[PDB]
Amino acid sequence: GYGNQGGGYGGGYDNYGGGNYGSGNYNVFGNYNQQPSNYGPMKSGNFGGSRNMG
Amino acid sequence: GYGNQGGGYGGGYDNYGGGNYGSGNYNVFGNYNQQPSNYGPMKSGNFGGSRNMG
Amino acid sequence: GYGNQGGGYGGGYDNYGGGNYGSGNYNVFGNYNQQPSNYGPMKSGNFGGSRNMG
Amino acid sequence: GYGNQGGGYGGGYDNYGGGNYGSGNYNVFGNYNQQPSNYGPMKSGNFGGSRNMG
Amino acid sequence: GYGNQGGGYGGGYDNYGGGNYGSGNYNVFGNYNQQPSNYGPMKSGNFGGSRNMG
Amino acid sequence: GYGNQGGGYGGGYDNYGGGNYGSGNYNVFGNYNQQPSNYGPMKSGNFGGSRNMG
Amino acid sequence: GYGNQGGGYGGGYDNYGGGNYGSGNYNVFGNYNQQPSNYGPMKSGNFGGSRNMG
Amino acid sequence: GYGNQGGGYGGGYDNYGGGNYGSGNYNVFGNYNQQPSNYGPMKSGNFGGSRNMG
Amino acid sequence: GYGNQGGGYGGGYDNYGGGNYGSGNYNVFGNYNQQPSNYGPMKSGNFGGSRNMG
Amino acid sequence: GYGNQGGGYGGGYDNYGGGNYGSGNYNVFGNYNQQPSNYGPMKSGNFGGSRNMG
Amino acid sequence: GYGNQGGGYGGGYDNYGGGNYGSGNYNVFGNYNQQPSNYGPMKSGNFGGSRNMG
Amino acid sequence: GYGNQGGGYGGGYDNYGGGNYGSGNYNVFGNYNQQPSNYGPMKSGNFGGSRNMG
Amino acid sequence: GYGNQGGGYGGGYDNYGGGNYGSGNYNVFGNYNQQPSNYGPMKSGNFGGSRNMG
Amino acid sequence: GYGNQGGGYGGGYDNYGGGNYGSGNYNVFGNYNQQPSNYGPMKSGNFGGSRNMG
Amino acid sequence: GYGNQGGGYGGGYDNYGGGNYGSGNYNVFGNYNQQPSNYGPMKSGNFGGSRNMG
């Protein structure tokens, strides 16, 4: 693994979004079980005209 | 793995979106089980005219 | 793996969208089971005229 | 694997959309089981006149 | 694998759309099982006059 | 309406099964809607050698 | 309407099965709509040697 | 309406099963809506050799 | 309405099962809504050799 | 309305099961709403050889 | 109503533009009806230096 | 109502623009109805140096 | 109502702009109805140096 | 009402702009109704040095 | 009401701007209703050095 050398703007290994969202669960249910799950909107990155050049 | 050398703008290995969203689950259910799941909108990247050049 | 050398704009190995969305599940259900799943819109990339040149 | 050398704009190995969407599932159901699944619209790439040249 | 050398615009190995959409499933159902699946519109690429030259 | 007069066994106006099962619905759906419905077995009447004479 | 007068066994106006099963629906759907429906076996009447005489 | 007069066994206006099971619904849905419904087995009447004569 | 006069056993206007099970609902949903519903088995009447004569 | 006159056993207007089970609901939902509902088994009537004659 | 008496130029009761443009419509629509309407530019009067004096 | 008497130029009761533009509509719509309406630019009067004196 | 008597230029009761623009509408809508309306620019009067004196 | 008597220029009762712009509407909406309205710029009067004296 | 008598320039009862802009509306909305309204710039009067004296 080698990082970026150069660039007009800042070049980096930016991780904005990732991971596990309710994954790898081990559920054993009997009869009347309810497991609701809600995940809100995910906004990862540059928003509102960010990282602009003057 | 070798990173970017150069560019007019910042060249980098940017990861905006990824991962697991309710994957790899192990569910064993009996009789009347309910497992609802909702995932909101995913916005990954540059939004609103971001990373622009002046 | 060799990264980009150069370009007019920032050349990089950008990953905007990816991953698993409710994949690889192991479900064993008996009788009356309900497993609803909803995934919202996925917006990956550049939006609203992003990464433009002046 | 060799990256792009040069170009008028930023040449890179951009991955906008991909992955698994409810794939590779292992489901064994008995009697009255319901497994509904909805996937919203996927927008991957450049939208709204993005990555333009002035 | 060798990347693009040059071009008037940014030449890169861009992947806009791909992957598996409910593929490779292993389903064994008995009696009255329902497995509905809906996939929304997929928009991969450049939209709204993107990647234009001034 | 006049009921039964007599008989060797009990004569009556027995209603074992009836009604509406998801009938008269008013559904107006747009785009990707799923409305699954499952109704289990209906057993109406005399079962297991019922209402027998010694 | 006059009921039964007499008989060796019990004579009556027995209604075992009837009704509406997903009838008279008013559905107006647009684009990609799915409305699956399953009705299980209906067993109406006398079963297992019922209403026998000794 | 006149009830039963007589009989060897008890003659009556017995209602074992009936009613509405998810009927007359007024649903107006937009985009990705899921409304699953499961109804279990209905056992109405005499079971296990009931209402027998010695 | 006139009740039963007589009989070998007790003649009465017995209502074992009935009513509304999720009927007459007024649902107006937008975007990603899930309304799962499960109804268990209904056992109405005489079970296990009930109301027998010695 | 006139009740039962007589009988070998107790003749009465017995109501074992009835009512509304999540009926007549007025639900207006927006975006990602989940309303799961489970109703257990309903046992209405005479069970285990009840109301027998010696 | 009395007309103009005199003037340096021609005085008259000139009506250049007027009327009803899709007005007073009686529309009763059911389910998915579309009634688009476009009205082009209206140029009423004197244009290009008209009604000039030498 | 009395018209103009005199003037250096032509005095008259000129009506250039007026009327109803999609007014007084009676619309009763059910479910998914769309009634778009576009009205172009209205130019009423004297344009391009009209009604000038030499 | 009495008109103008005299003047250096033509004095008149000129109506350039007026009327109703989507007014007095009677709309009764149910569920998902859309009634968009666009009105273009209105230019009423004298433009481009009109009604000038030499 | 008496009109103008005299003046250096043409004195008149000029109405350039007026009327109703989406006024007096009677709207009764149920559930998800959208009624967007756009009115363009209104230019009423004398523009570009109009009604000038030489 | 008496009009102007005289003046160096044309004296008149000029109405440049007025009226109702989305006023007097009768709106009764239920649940999720949206009624956006945009009114553009209003320019009423004399612009660009109009009605000047030489």
PDB file of N, CA and C in Angstrom, chain H residues 1 3-12 14-16 18-20 22-23 25-34 36-38 40-41 43-48 50-52 54, chain I residues 2 4-6 8-9 12-19 21-29 31-39 41-47 49-53:
ATOM      1  N   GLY H   1     -88.059 -14.918  12.049  1.00  0.00           N
ATOM      2  CA  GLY H   1     -87.115 -15.902  12.547  1.00  0.00           C
ATOM      3  C   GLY H   1     -87.659 -16.720  13.701  1.00  0.00           C
ATOM      4  N   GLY H   3     -86.917 -20.264  16.067  1.00  0.00           N
ATOM      5  CA  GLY H   3     -85.918 -21.247  16.427  1.00  0.00           C
ATOM      6  C   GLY H   3     -86.411 -22.669  16.251  1.00  0.00           C
ATOM      7  N   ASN H   4     -85.492 -23.612  16.440  1.00  0.00           N
ATOM      8  CA  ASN H   4     -85.837 -25.021  16.324  1.00  0.00           C
ATOM      9  C   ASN H   4     -86.815 -25.422  17.423  1.00  0.00           C
ATOM     10  N   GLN H   5     -87.686 -26.378  17.100  1.00  0.00           N
ATOM     11  CA  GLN H   5     -88.680 -26.853  18.058  1.00  0.00           C
ATOM     12  C   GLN H   5     -88.112 -27.943  18.963  1.00  0.00           C
ATOM     13  N   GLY H   6     -87.635 -29.034  18.371  1.00  0.00           N
ATOM     14  CA  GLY H   6     -87.116 -30.138  19.156  1.00  0.00           C
ATOM     15  C   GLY H   6     -86.199 -31.007  18.327  1.00  0.00           C
ATOM     16  N   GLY H   7     -85.596 -31.977  18.999  1.00  0.00           N
ATOM     17  CA  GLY H   7     -84.710 -32.909  18.329  1.00  0.00           C
ATOM     18  C   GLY H   7     -84.095 -33.863  19.327  1.00  0.00           C
ATOM     19  N   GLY H   8     -83.497 -34.925  18.786  1.00  0.00           N
ATOM     20  CA  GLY H   8     -82.822 -35.893  19.636  1.00  0.00           C
ATOM     21  C   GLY H   8     -81.653 -35.288  20.388  1.00  0.00           C
ATOM     22  N   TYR H   9     -80.918 -34.394  19.741  1.00  0.00           N
ATOM     23  CA  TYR H   9     -79.841 -33.639  20.362  1.00  0.00           C
ATOM     24  C   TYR H   9     -80.247 -32.169  20.440  1.00  0.00           C
ATOM     25  N   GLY H  10     -79.346 -31.346  20.969  1.00  0.00           N
ATOM     26  CA  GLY H  10     -79.639 -29.937  21.145  1.00  0.00           C
ATOM     27  C   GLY H  10     -79.606 -29.185  19.830  1.00  0.00           C
ATOM     28  N   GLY H  11     -80.773 -28.783  19.335  1.00  0.00           N
ATOM     29  CA  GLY H  11     -80.853 -27.992  18.123  1.00  0.00           C
ATOM     30  C   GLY H  11     -80.822 -26.502  18.394  1.00  0.00           C
ATOM     31  N   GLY H  12     -79.798 -25.824  17.897  1.00  0.00           N
ATOM     32  CA  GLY H  12     -79.658 -24.395  18.112  1.00  0.00           C
ATOM     33  C   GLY H  12     -79.011 -23.725  16.918  1.00  0.00           C
ATOM     34  N   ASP H  14     -76.250 -22.231  16.033  1.00  0.00           N
ATOM     35  CA  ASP H  14     -74.850 -22.095  16.410  1.00  0.00           C
ATOM     36  C   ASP H  14     -74.061 -21.504  15.249  1.00  0.00           C
ATOM     37  N   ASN H  15     -73.374 -20.393  15.506  1.00  0.00           N
ATOM     38  CA  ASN H  15     -72.455 -19.790  14.546  1.00  0.00           C
ATOM     39  C   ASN H  15     -71.035 -20.076  15.017  1.00  0.00           C
ATOM     40  N   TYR H  16     -70.333 -20.939  14.287  1.00  0.00           N
ATOM     41  CA  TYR H  16     -68.986 -21.338  14.680  1.00  0.00           C
ATOM     42  C   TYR H  16     -67.928 -20.417  14.075  1.00  0.00           C
ATOM     43  N   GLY H  18     -67.127 -17.091  11.157  1.00  0.00           N
ATOM     44  CA  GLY H  18     -67.645 -16.024  10.321  1.00  0.00           C
ATOM     45  C   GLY H  18     -66.877 -14.745  10.566  1.00  0.00           C
ATOM     46  N   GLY H  19     -67.302 -13.697   9.865  1.00  0.00           N
ATOM     47  CA  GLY H  19     -66.763 -12.367  10.036  1.00  0.00           C
ATOM     48  C   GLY H  19     -65.986 -11.929   8.819  1.00  0.00           C
ATOM     49  N   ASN H  20     -65.204 -10.867   8.993  1.00  0.00           N
ATOM     50  CA  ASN H  20     -64.373 -10.312   7.933  1.00  0.00           C
ATOM     51  C   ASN H  20     -62.915 -10.511   8.309  1.00  0.00           C
ATOM     52  N   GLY H  22     -59.597  -9.108   7.069  1.00  0.00           N
ATOM     53  CA  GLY H  22     -58.884  -8.146   6.251  1.00  0.00           C
ATOM     54  C   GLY H  22     -59.662  -7.703   5.032  1.00  0.00           C
ATOM     55  N   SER H  23     -60.942  -7.398   5.218  1.00  0.00           N
ATOM     56  CA  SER H  23     -61.828  -7.029   4.127  1.00  0.00           C
ATOM     57  C   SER H  23     -62.252  -5.575   4.263  1.00  0.00           C
ATOM     58  N   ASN H  25     -60.708  -2.985   3.177  1.00  0.00           N
ATOM     59  CA  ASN H  25     -59.586  -2.093   3.415  1.00  0.00           C
ATOM     60  C   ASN H  25     -59.562  -0.971   2.386  1.00  0.00           C
ATOM     61  N   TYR H  26     -59.124   0.205   2.823  1.00  0.00           N
ATOM     62  CA  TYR H  26     -58.920   1.356   1.952  1.00  0.00           C
ATOM     63  C   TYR H  26     -57.442   1.713   2.018  1.00  0.00           C
ATOM     64  N   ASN H  27     -56.677   1.271   1.026  1.00  0.00           N
ATOM     65  CA  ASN H  27     -55.235   1.474   1.000  1.00  0.00           C
ATOM     66  C   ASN H  27     -54.864   2.288  -0.228  1.00  0.00           C
ATOM     67  N   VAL H  28     -54.172   3.402  -0.009  1.00  0.00           N
ATOM     68  CA  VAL H  28     -53.600   4.208  -1.080  1.00  0.00           C
ATOM     69  C   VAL H  28     -52.106   4.289  -0.811  1.00  0.00           C
ATOM     70  N   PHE H  29     -51.311   3.651  -1.663  1.00  0.00           N
ATOM     71  CA  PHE H  29     -49.880   3.518  -1.443  1.00  0.00           C
ATOM     72  C   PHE H  29     -49.106   4.244  -2.533  1.00  0.00           C
ATOM     73  N   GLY H  30     -47.953   4.787  -2.152  1.00  0.00           N
ATOM     74  CA  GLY H  30     -47.056   5.415  -3.101  1.00  0.00           C
ATOM     75  C   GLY H  30     -45.656   4.841  -3.047  1.00  0.00           C
ATOM     76  N   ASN H  31     -45.079   4.563  -4.217  1.00  0.00           N
ATOM     77  CA  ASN H  31     -43.702   4.078  -4.357  1.00  0.00           C
ATOM     78  C   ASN H  31     -43.591   2.704  -3.709  1.00  0.00           C
ATOM     79  N   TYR H  32     -42.657   2.477  -2.784  1.00  0.00           N
ATOM     80  CA  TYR H  32     -42.291   1.129  -2.345  1.00  0.00           C
ATOM     81  C   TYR H  32     -42.980   0.804  -1.024  1.00  0.00           C
ATOM     82  N   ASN H  33     -44.211   0.315  -1.113  1.00  0.00           N
ATOM     83  CA  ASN H  33     -44.955  -0.082   0.070  1.00  0.00           C
ATOM     84  C   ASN H  33     -45.212  -1.581   0.067  1.00  0.00           C
ATOM     85  N   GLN H  34     -45.112  -2.179   1.252  1.00  0.00           N
ATOM     86  CA  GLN H  34     -45.336  -3.605   1.436  1.00  0.00           C
ATOM     87  C   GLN H  34     -46.354  -3.806   2.543  1.00  0.00           C
ATOM     88  N   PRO H  36     -47.836  -7.119   3.844  1.00  0.00           N
ATOM     89  CA  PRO H  36     -48.067  -8.559   3.957  1.00  0.00           C
ATOM     90  C   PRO H  36     -49.095  -8.883   5.028  1.00  0.00           C
ATOM     91  N   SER H  37     -49.825  -9.972   4.791  1.00  0.00           N
ATOM     92  CA  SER H  37     -50.869 -10.411   5.708  1.00  0.00           C
ATOM     93  C   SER H  37     -50.934 -11.929   5.710  1.00  0.00           C
ATOM     94  N   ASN H  38     -50.938 -12.519   6.902  1.00  0.00           N
ATOM     95  CA  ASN H  38     -51.039 -13.963   7.073  1.00  0.00           C
ATOM     96  C   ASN H  38     -52.168 -14.268   8.043  1.00  0.00           C
ATOM     97  N   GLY H  40     -53.916 -17.539  10.043  1.00  0.00           N
ATOM     98  CA  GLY H  40     -53.689 -18.907  10.399  1.00  0.00           C
ATOM     99  C   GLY H  40     -54.897 -19.776  10.105  1.00  0.00           C
ATOM    100  N   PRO H  41     -54.740 -21.080  10.318  1.00  0.00           N
ATOM    101  CA  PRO H  41     -55.853 -22.000  10.066  1.00  0.00           C
ATOM    102  C   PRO H  41     -57.036 -21.699  10.971  1.00  0.00           C
ATOM    103  N   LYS H  43     -60.398 -23.267  12.583  1.00  0.00           N
ATOM    104  CA  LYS H  43     -61.094 -24.498  12.933  1.00  0.00           C
ATOM    105  C   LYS H  43     -62.378 -24.120  13.656  1.00  0.00           C
ATOM    106  N   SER H  44     -63.506 -24.225  12.957  1.00  0.00           N
ATOM    107  CA  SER H  44     -64.806 -23.862  13.506  1.00  0.00           C
ATOM    108  C   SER H  44     -65.718 -25.075  13.439  1.00  0.00           C
ATOM    109  N   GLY H  45     -66.347 -25.408  14.562  1.00  0.00           N
ATOM    110  CA  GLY H  45     -67.255 -26.536  14.597  1.00  0.00           C
ATOM    111  C   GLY H  45     -67.016 -27.470  15.762  1.00  0.00           C
ATOM    112  N   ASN H  46     -67.221 -28.763  15.537  1.00  0.00           N
ATOM    113  CA  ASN H  46     -67.020 -29.789  16.551  1.00  0.00           C
ATOM    114  C   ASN H  46     -65.838 -30.648  16.132  1.00  0.00           C
ATOM    115  N   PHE H  47     -64.880 -30.817  17.038  1.00  0.00           N
ATOM    116  CA  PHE H  47     -63.643 -31.520  16.744  1.00  0.00           C
ATOM    117  C   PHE H  47     -63.392 -32.576  17.810  1.00  0.00           C
ATOM    118  N   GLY H  48     -62.628 -33.595  17.431  1.00  0.00           N
ATOM    119  CA  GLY H  48     -62.290 -34.663  18.358  1.00  0.00           C
ATOM    120  C   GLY H  48     -63.482 -35.447  18.858  1.00  0.00           C
ATOM    121  N   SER H  50     -66.760 -34.542  19.197  1.00  0.00           N
ATOM    122  CA  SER H  50     -67.553 -33.767  20.136  1.00  0.00           C
ATOM    123  C   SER H  50     -69.043 -33.903  19.840  1.00  0.00           C
ATOM    124  N   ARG H  51     -69.850 -33.554  20.844  1.00  0.00           N
ATOM    125  CA  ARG H  51     -71.312 -33.598  20.754  1.00  0.00           C
ATOM    126  C   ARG H  51     -71.813 -34.994  20.391  1.00  0.00           C
ATOM    127  N   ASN H  52     -71.178 -36.015  20.956  1.00  0.00           N
ATOM    128  CA  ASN H  52     -71.569 -37.396  20.719  1.00  0.00           C
ATOM    129  C   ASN H  52     -72.635 -37.837  21.716  1.00  0.00           C
ATOM    130  N   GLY H  54     -74.019 -41.034  24.090  1.00  0.00           N
ATOM    131  CA  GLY H  54     -73.584 -42.249  24.753  1.00  0.00           C
ATOM    132  C   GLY H  54     -74.501 -43.426  24.486  1.00  0.00           C
TER     133      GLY H  54
ATOM    134  N   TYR I   2     -86.922 -15.777  17.689  1.00  0.00           N
ATOM    135  CA  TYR I   2     -87.455 -16.681  18.699  1.00  0.00           C
ATOM    136  C   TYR I   2     -86.432 -17.772  18.975  1.00  0.00           C
ATOM    137  N   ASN I   4     -84.764 -21.369  20.645  1.00  0.00           N
ATOM    138  CA  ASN I   4     -85.126 -22.774  20.532  1.00  0.00           C
ATOM    139  C   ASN I   4     -86.113 -23.162  21.628  1.00  0.00           C
ATOM    140  N   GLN I   5     -86.993 -24.108  21.304  1.00  0.00           N
ATOM    141  CA  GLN I   5     -87.996 -24.569  22.258  1.00  0.00           C
ATOM    142  C   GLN I   5     -87.445 -25.663  23.170  1.00  0.00           C
ATOM    143  N   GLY I   6     -86.978 -26.761  22.584  1.00  0.00           N
ATOM    144  CA  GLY I   6     -86.474 -27.868  23.375  1.00  0.00           C
ATOM    145  C   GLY I   6     -85.564 -28.750  22.553  1.00  0.00           C
ATOM    146  N   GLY I   8     -82.907 -32.696  23.038  1.00  0.00           N
ATOM    147  CA  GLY I   8     -82.247 -33.668  23.894  1.00  0.00           C
ATOM    148  C   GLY I   8     -81.075 -33.074  24.651  1.00  0.00           C
ATOM    149  N   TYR I   9     -80.327 -32.190  24.004  1.00  0.00           N
ATOM    150  CA  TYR I   9     -79.245 -31.446  24.628  1.00  0.00           C
ATOM    151  C   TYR I   9     -79.634 -29.971  24.699  1.00  0.00           C
ATOM    152  N   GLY I  12     -79.103 -23.638  22.138  1.00  0.00           N
ATOM    153  CA  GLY I  12     -78.948 -22.211  22.349  1.00  0.00           C
ATOM    154  C   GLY I  12     -78.287 -21.553  21.157  1.00  0.00           C
ATOM    155  N   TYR I  13     -78.403 -20.226  21.109  1.00  0.00           N
ATOM    156  CA  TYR I  13     -77.808 -19.427  20.036  1.00  0.00           C
ATOM    157  C   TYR I  13     -76.364 -19.083  20.401  1.00  0.00           C
ATOM    158  N   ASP I  14     -75.507 -20.092  20.279  1.00  0.00           N
ATOM    159  CA  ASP I  14     -74.107 -19.970  20.664  1.00  0.00           C
ATOM    160  C   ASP I  14     -73.305 -19.391  19.504  1.00  0.00           C
ATOM    161  N   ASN I  15     -72.608 -18.288  19.762  1.00  0.00           N
ATOM    162  CA  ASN I  15     -71.677 -17.698  18.805  1.00  0.00           C
ATOM    163  C   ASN I  15     -70.263 -17.997  19.283  1.00  0.00           C
ATOM    164  N   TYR I  16     -69.567 -18.871  18.559  1.00  0.00           N
ATOM    165  CA  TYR I  16     -68.227 -19.284  18.960  1.00  0.00           C
ATOM    166  C   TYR I  16     -67.156 -18.376  18.357  1.00  0.00           C
ATOM    167  N   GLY I  17     -67.249 -18.105  17.063  1.00  0.00           N
ATOM    168  CA  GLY I  17     -66.276 -17.266  16.393  1.00  0.00           C
ATOM    169  C   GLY I  17     -66.942 -16.230  15.515  1.00  0.00           C
ATOM    170  N   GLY I  18     -66.304 -15.068  15.432  1.00  0.00           N
ATOM    171  CA  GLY I  18     -66.805 -14.000  14.591  1.00  0.00           C
ATOM    172  C   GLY I  18     -66.025 -12.727  14.835  1.00  0.00           C
ATOM    173  N   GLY I  19     -66.435 -11.677  14.129  1.00  0.00           N
ATOM    174  CA  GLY I  19     -65.883 -10.353  14.298  1.00  0.00           C
ATOM    175  C   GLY I  19     -65.095  -9.928  13.085  1.00  0.00           C
ATOM    176  N   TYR I  21     -61.207  -9.017  11.636  1.00  0.00           N
ATOM    177  CA  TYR I  21     -59.788  -9.276  11.851  1.00  0.00           C
ATOM    178  C   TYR I  21     -59.006  -8.383  10.895  1.00  0.00           C
ATOM    179  N   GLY I  22     -58.666  -7.183  11.357  1.00  0.00           N
ATOM    180  CA  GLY I  22     -57.939  -6.231  10.539  1.00  0.00           C
ATOM    181  C   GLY I  22     -58.706  -5.784   9.315  1.00  0.00           C
ATOM    182  N   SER I  23     -59.983  -5.464   9.493  1.00  0.00           N
ATOM    183  CA  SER I  23     -60.859  -5.089   8.396  1.00  0.00           C
ATOM    184  C   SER I  23     -61.268  -3.629   8.526  1.00  0.00           C
ATOM    185  N   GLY I  24     -61.635  -3.032   7.396  1.00  0.00           N
ATOM    186  CA  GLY I  24     -62.051  -1.644   7.398  1.00  0.00           C
ATOM    187  C   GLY I  24     -60.937  -0.665   7.676  1.00  0.00           C
ATOM    188  N   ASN I  25     -59.691  -1.060   7.439  1.00  0.00           N
ATOM    189  CA  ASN I  25     -58.559  -0.180   7.680  1.00  0.00           C
ATOM    190  C   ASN I  25     -58.518   0.938   6.648  1.00  0.00           C
ATOM    191  N   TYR I  26     -58.069   2.110   7.083  1.00  0.00           N
ATOM    192  CA  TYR I  26     -57.848   3.256   6.209  1.00  0.00           C
ATOM    193  C   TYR I  26     -56.367   3.598   6.281  1.00  0.00           C
ATOM    194  N   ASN I  27     -55.601   3.144   5.294  1.00  0.00           N
ATOM    195  CA  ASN I  27     -54.158   3.331   5.275  1.00  0.00           C
ATOM    196  C   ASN I  27     -53.771   4.137   4.046  1.00  0.00           C
ATOM    197  N   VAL I  28     -53.068   5.244   4.265  1.00  0.00           N
ATOM    198  CA  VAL I  28     -52.482   6.039   3.195  1.00  0.00           C
ATOM    199  C   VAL I  28     -50.989   6.105   3.471  1.00  0.00           C
ATOM    200  N   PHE I  29     -50.196   5.456   2.624  1.00  0.00           N
ATOM    201  CA  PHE I  29     -48.768   5.308   2.851  1.00  0.00           C
ATOM    202  C   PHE I  29     -47.980   6.022   1.763  1.00  0.00           C
ATOM    203  N   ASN I  31     -43.943   6.291   0.098  1.00  0.00           N
ATOM    204  CA  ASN I  31     -42.570   5.790  -0.033  1.00  0.00           C
ATOM    205  C   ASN I  31     -42.478   4.417   0.620  1.00  0.00           C
ATOM    206  N   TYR I  32     -41.550   4.181   1.551  1.00  0.00           N
ATOM    207  CA  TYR I  32     -41.202   2.832   1.995  1.00  0.00           C
ATOM    208  C   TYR I  32     -41.901   2.519   3.314  1.00  0.00           C
ATOM    209  N   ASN I  33     -43.136   2.044   3.220  1.00  0.00           N
ATOM    210  CA  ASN I  33     -43.891   1.658   4.402  1.00  0.00           C
ATOM    211  C   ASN I  33     -44.164   0.162   4.401  1.00  0.00           C
ATOM    212  N   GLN I  34     -44.077  -0.434   5.589  1.00  0.00           N
ATOM    213  CA  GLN I  34     -44.317  -1.856   5.776  1.00  0.00           C
ATOM    214  C   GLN I  34     -45.343  -2.041   6.879  1.00  0.00           C
ATOM    215  N   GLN I  35     -46.406  -2.781   6.582  1.00  0.00           N
ATOM    216  CA  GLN I  35     -47.467  -3.054   7.550  1.00  0.00           C
ATOM    217  C   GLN I  35     -47.744  -4.548   7.567  1.00  0.00           C
ATOM    218  N   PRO I  36     -46.867  -5.334   8.183  1.00  0.00           N
ATOM    219  CA  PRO I  36     -47.115  -6.771   8.299  1.00  0.00           C
ATOM    220  C   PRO I  36     -48.152  -7.081   9.367  1.00  0.00           C
ATOM    221  N   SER I  37     -48.893  -8.162   9.130  1.00  0.00           N
ATOM    222  CA  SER I  37     -49.945  -8.586  10.042  1.00  0.00           C
ATOM    223  C   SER I  37     -50.028 -10.103  10.049  1.00  0.00           C
ATOM    224  N   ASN I  38     -50.043 -10.690  11.243  1.00  0.00           N
ATOM    225  CA  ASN I  38     -50.163 -12.132  11.418  1.00  0.00           C
ATOM    226  C   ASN I  38     -51.300 -12.422  12.384  1.00  0.00           C
ATOM    227  N   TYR I  39     -52.172 -13.350  12.007  1.00  0.00           N
ATOM    228  CA  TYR I  39     -53.271 -13.791  12.854  1.00  0.00           C
ATOM    229  C   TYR I  39     -53.109 -15.282  13.110  1.00  0.00           C
ATOM    230  N   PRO I  41     -53.957 -19.198  14.668  1.00  0.00           N
ATOM    231  CA  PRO I  41     -55.079 -20.106  14.414  1.00  0.00           C
ATOM    232  C   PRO I  41     -56.264 -19.788  15.312  1.00  0.00           C
ATOM    233  N   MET I  42     -57.458 -19.866  14.737  1.00  0.00           N
ATOM    234  CA  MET I  42     -58.698 -19.623  15.463  1.00  0.00           C
ATOM    235  C   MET I  42     -59.418 -20.949  15.656  1.00  0.00           C
ATOM    236  N   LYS I  43     -59.651 -21.314  16.912  1.00  0.00           N
ATOM    237  CA  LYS I  43     -60.362 -22.536  17.262  1.00  0.00           C
ATOM    238  C   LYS I  43     -61.646 -22.142  17.978  1.00  0.00           C
ATOM    239  N   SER I  44     -62.770 -22.236  17.274  1.00  0.00           N
ATOM    240  CA  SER I  44     -64.069 -21.857  17.815  1.00  0.00           C
ATOM    241  C   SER I  44     -64.994 -23.061  17.748  1.00  0.00           C
ATOM    242  N   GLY I  45     -65.632 -23.383  18.869  1.00  0.00           N
ATOM    243  CA  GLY I  45     -66.553 -24.500  18.902  1.00  0.00           C
ATOM    244  C   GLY I  45     -66.330 -25.433  20.071  1.00  0.00           C
ATOM    245  N   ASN I  46     -66.549 -26.726  19.850  1.00  0.00           N
ATOM    246  CA  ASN I  46     -66.364 -27.750  20.868  1.00  0.00           C
ATOM    247  C   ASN I  46     -65.190 -28.623  20.458  1.00  0.00           C
ATOM    248  N   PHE I  47     -64.237 -28.799  21.368  1.00  0.00           N
ATOM    249  CA  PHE I  47     -63.006 -29.517  21.083  1.00  0.00           C
ATOM    250  C   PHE I  47     -62.773 -30.572  22.154  1.00  0.00           C
ATOM    251  N   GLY I  49     -63.855 -33.719  22.328  1.00  0.00           N
ATOM    252  CA  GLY I  49     -65.033 -34.474  22.708  1.00  0.00           C
ATOM    253  C   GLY I  49     -65.893 -33.779  23.741  1.00  0.00           C
ATOM    254  N   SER I  50     -66.169 -32.497  23.531  1.00  0.00           N
ATOM    255  CA  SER I  50     -66.958 -31.709  24.463  1.00  0.00           C
ATOM    256  C   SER I  50     -68.447 -31.831  24.160  1.00  0.00           C
ATOM    257  N   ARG I  51     -69.257 -31.469  25.158  1.00  0.00           N
ATOM    258  CA  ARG I  51     -70.718 -31.497  25.062  1.00  0.00           C
ATOM    259  C   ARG I  51     -71.232 -32.889  24.700  1.00  0.00           C
ATOM    260  N   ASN I  52     -70.611 -33.915  25.272  1.00  0.00           N
ATOM    261  CA  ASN I  52     -71.017 -35.291  25.037  1.00  0.00           C
ATOM    262  C   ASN I  52     -72.093 -35.718  26.031  1.00  0.00           C
ATOM    263  N   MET I  53     -72.789 -36.796  25.683  1.00  0.00           N
ATOM    264  CA  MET I  53     -73.814 -37.387  26.532  1.00  0.00           C
ATOM    265  C   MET I  53     -73.297 -38.694  27.115  1.00  0.00           C
TER     266      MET I  53
END
